[PDB]
Amino acid sequence: MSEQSICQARAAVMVYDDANKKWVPAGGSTGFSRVHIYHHTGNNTFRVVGRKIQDHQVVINCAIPKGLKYNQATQTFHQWRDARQVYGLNFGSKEDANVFASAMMHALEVL
């Protein structure tokens, strides 16, 4: 397989609607997702890909660039921003937040 999952964590994936200063559910679909970080070993790249638990819709698919600032705002809500959007993960548990942050931080160390 070209891409290998390095973690799976449960979270409600949010994107920030700057115009209304409000978080809104990614993909317009309230509820929780299974959120992976996938590693493409060929070029050592990483992306966050999350799918709704119910209907499998992909609600996030974003690259993790070198130098990203991953903000652990709370024990259960982490966020980061790129050139177009601000993403937030409202984790199902502190354990899920810890798993995801570990993998993210690993990725950011090896990029």
Ligand X SMILES: CC[C@@H]1C=C[C@H]2CCN(C(=O)[C@@H]3CC[C@H]4C=C[C@]5(CCCN5C(=O)[C@H](Cc5ccccc5Cl)NC(C)=O)C(=O)N43)[C@@H]2C(=O)N1CC(=O)O
Q: Where do contacts with ligand X occur on this chain (CB under 6 A)? A: 14, 16, 23, 69, 71, 73-74, 77, 79-81, 86, 88, 90
| Smallest distance from ligand X to CB 1, Å | 31
> How far apart, in whole angstroms, are the C-alpha atoms of residue 43 and residue 79?
25
DSSP line for 61-111: EEE--TT---B--SSSEEEEE-SS-EEEEEESSHHHHHHHHHHHHHHHHH-
Residue 8 vs 16, nearer CB to ligand X:
16
Residue 4 vs 75, nearer CB to ligand X:
75
| Smallest distance from ligand X to CB 96, Å | 15
> How far apart, in whole angstroms, are the C-alpha atoms of residue 37 and residue 54?
20
Residue 69 vs 84, nearer CB to ligand X:
69
| Smallest distance from ligand X to CB 4, Å | 26
Eight-state DSSP code of residue 43:
G
| Smallest distance from ligand X to CB 79, Å | 4
Q: Which residues on neighbouring strands pair with residue 22, listed in sequence order?
A: 17
